Design a protein around this nucleic acid. Structure first.
Length: 72
RNA sequence: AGCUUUGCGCAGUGGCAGUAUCGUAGCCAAUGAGGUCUAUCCGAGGCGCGAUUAUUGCUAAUUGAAAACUUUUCCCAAUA
């Protein structure tokens, strides 16, 4: 169904972003800035700073290629 | 026909700032730069390197000079 998007990112992240976005058409009609925020759980900072909780983070960030980078 | 909006030059007057302005045959960037607020939201340059009195010229003092110093075979000691 989505060969190019499965080539760029793994099919697990592909499925997790396609399901949460409402389908391939809805995800394709979504701005690029709103795709990085798909599946971003509002983790509650437990005393720690907001940066430690990694705010505004979604499937893309936790994908394999992005997680293969230094944290900075 | 007057008035008026925006952009752009050309000038004139005035104010403020000098820890900053400028450069890019370097790289990257609306096919997304860059993200602490408020992020299914913000949207523009950034990075590297180089120049410098932290933009650069003239103008006028002062100093350093510069022009000169005898810029020319002395002394301790020996003998006639």
């Amino acid at each position: 169904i989505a060969p190019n998007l499965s080539i760029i990112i793994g099919a697990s992240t592909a499925a997790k972003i396609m399901g949460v976005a409402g389908g391939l058409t809805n995800l394709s009609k979504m701005p690029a800035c709103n795709i990085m925020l798909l599946g971003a759980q509002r983790k509650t900072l437990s005393g720690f700073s907001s940066t430690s909780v990694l705010p505004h983070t979604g499937y893309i960030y936790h994908s394999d290629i992005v997680q293969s980078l230094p944290p900075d």
